[PDB]
């Protein structure tokens, strides 16, 4: 219930402590989802963008940046990776959807679709998650790793319990996202832990 | 008899099992043909795009991607290769024609002609093929190789028993192909085997 | 009290001793500041752009170019670094701000914001500085290092005791800078030491 | 005489056999000449573009591609080479002129002049040539070398017994060449030997 | 007293002999000068562009190209070098000025200023020079070096006994140079020695 429109979280340093917890009242396992957000980082090493863990389940839903031009999604421990030509460093808009019935994961980078990949067909992503920005969880809420920490800025984060069609991905990219029912940047419940600063978004 | 307009086959993972069989009424050997399709893959290793084998004849008609920027056509186990400047990764539209009387092979990449090459002048491509997408055949219908598997998306596949002139190549590229009499994306008989998913084409 | 409009300092050679002292009656420690200037150098080795030391304190406020595309700010010996795509050699406009309350350092290169970083939250930059262009200080006013010397041209330098908003940054870059209260190019007090020549600015 | 307007010779494979003989009625030594043609090849090794030998005299007039971006002219066994930034692979339009009185050779690539070079000032290129496309001659009409063979397509070839000024070079590049008196694509006397196929020009 | 408007000197081969002597009415030592000319060469090795020697003094005023993207000026055997982004091979317009009072050398490449450098403050360039294009002098008029020879084309050369302001540099670049009192392409006294050919300028 905080509207962060026009603002970003800044993770201004590398650490094993700095992070934001995102709170969602999700109690039903997910068959489908889409996650979109905007990020600006000049890290060359790998890092976690979005870490969603549940009780007894590490890497239940994880968006991980392997290196420049390579984006990975983990579902239930398994992963897929797709490549893109991108400038570095540069602000980026990232969406990824996943659909249990087919296992298909769709990444979109700056409104451009990456090659589809597939994993975990028939799997249900569990609910009552702990969701962390800034660090990658290895436990339910913790066990961070400095070498996976995100340094930079994140904004405009939305998560839906459905697979967005292309037009709705583009809406989000263009700054007019459709209402989101899992996480909503315009009505976000979060906890800052450590050194995270909220600043205006100046790089769009 | 299936209309796949606006859809693609997604081969969402590397494997030695996942493939699509394409079924054609072909009992007469081929003197002339054109084959067009659209593909999107972020593999950098080599892979088969279109594998056509006949009884006792490996690589009877094979479209094979050597590496970024290099496309090969095999006719009757002989091969030619032509080069092109292309982005990686990127969607591509590929056409290739071959004419027995001259032996000339013409590749067209995104509506741009590659340098013509020639092979097997006077040869007839054998009939009663097994045609496979997703894997490269070494037997009549099988003996696949994981290191040659296609991971990504293929759509808009057409095959004609004639050599198309440039305007019809361009028309296919532009999404208004001439009706095709060997294989036709709008009236396709196919068999999915293993993990292959049909999805909307979102990258044109 | 000198108007350097349309002029630059030229540091025309590598040396250990050529430099300009910038004089400001700065008696109270700084909680906030912004520094903007234009520079043109074809050095590929590291160099100091702006060196501010106080008695007994090295690198109290230092803007340092590590290598092409990498800009560093030191506050009380601690540093942050941010990256940018830039041409080399090329003239550049650089602004950097820092805010004690948040620790946030903002670099802007040719009116483009770099990724925010953060350091020294709650700190105050010490007053009574010696401020040097052309050389990096390791003592209070001296102990230079030719391998860190700046060779090239600097102009349009301003320093304010506040964090400028983006509109004021862009005005400095391409419009009328807001008059500045610590250092101001239209009313600058300076001392030339060694081989430094004032010339018209010809590269904007 | 044959009008090859809108057509090309296709040398579809590497060989020591495949070539075209061109026949001119001139029957005089050459003091001045210009030669223009279009070519499209994806060879990265060296190759002969135009080979003119006379009785007992190798490399009497030879246009030879050393590697991407490097064009050589031999006159009377001596050579010059000039460089250009060019795309690879790509269609190219090539003109070269030579003037005995000055020795000056001018290459023009896609209507752009390369650096002038000079050779054989005062020499007369011998009369009664054998002129070959597709292979490099080492004898009067033969002694080819597969490692110097041209694989690809050639069209729009014209040769004049004078040095064309820039405006006439550009006319040739644009597809409105002045009528030519040594060799003329619109009234060409030629002999195909081995595997050379005439096809429509599809790459302009 | 020869008007070379629209023409260039072509140095069509590497040699230790080919050169042009430029003859000037200059008789007093030089405190200030500007030298502009256009050049086109595809040499990648080092070479001399303009060699001005006086009795007993090598490298009295020398414009030397170290390698692509790097231009050097020698005054009285001392050297400065400045860098630029340039295409290779490509025609270039080069101006360089030097002012004894400050020691400042200003290179301009295609109307774009390079970083200023400084040398020989207070020095007077000696009079009664021998000025050579095509070779680098090590004696008063001679002692050439094949590995420093200029191969290619030079035109539009002007030398003034003052430091030109930017507007006048740009005029020369654009083809409307001010009349020049040391050397002037429209009223030039020169001696061709060896293989140098005058041709029309075709690459502007
Ligand atoms: C998941 O999404 C698909 C469309 O992608 C939809 O057809 C399906 O009903 C969704 N499943 C659930 C449980 O909402
Ligand atoms: C194949 O093409 C050639 C030339 O285009 C033509 O002569 C021949 O009839 C074609 N063959 C068939 C069966 O159409
Ligand atoms: C400086 O900005 C701070 C935040 O660091 C702000 O709260 C304060 O008012 C400013 N301090 C001064 C001396 O202007
Ligand atoms: C070749 O060109 C030169 C120009 O130098 C001219 O003098 C000469 O007559 C030309 N030769 C012929 C046969 O036209
Ligand atoms: C050289 O230039 C300076 C300007 O800095 C000028 O004062 C001086 O007179 C010039 N010398 C001559 C002989 O013109
Ligand atoms: C161990 C490791 O490198 N990674 C990469 C992201 C997921 C997984 C982890 O830390 O849990
Ligand atoms: C053996 C091999 O490397 N290749 C490449 C494509 C055709 C052929 C094959 O697998 O049959
Ligand atoms: C020691 C060193 O390499 N540096 C780089 C700039 C700051 C610091 C110094 O010279 O004081
Ligand atoms: C021997 C050789 O390498 N060459 C290159 C072209 C001309 C010459 C020849 O084969 O005759
Ligand atoms: C010796 C040498 O390499 N050089 C480079 C230019 C100046 C100087 C000379 O030849 O005189
Ligand atoms: Ca984990
Ligand atoms: Ca971890
Ligand atoms: Ca096979
Ligand atoms: Ca195989
Ligand atoms: Ca220091
Ligand atoms: Ca130091
Ligand atoms: Ca030969
Ligand atoms: Ca040969
Ligand atoms: Ca010398
Ligand atoms: Ca020398």
Residue numbers in the entry:
A (entry chain E), B (entry chain D), C (entry chain B), D (entry chain A), E (entry chain C): 1 to 204
From the paper:
Serum amyloid P component (SAP) is a normal plasma glycoprotein that recognizes and binds to amyloid fibres in a calcium-dependent fashion wherever these are deposited in tissues. In summary, the structure of SAP is comprised of five identical 204-residue subunits associated in a ring 95 Å in diameter and 35 Å deep, with radial symmetry creating a central pore 20 Å wide. Each protomer consists of 15 β-strands (labelled A to O from the N-terminus to the C-terminus) arranged in two large β-sheets in the form of a flattened β-barrel with jelly-roll topology. The β-sheets are held nearly perpendicular to the radial symmetry, creating two separate and distinct faces: the A face, which contains five α-helices, and the opposing B face, which contains five double metal-binding sites formed by the coordination of six localized protein residues.
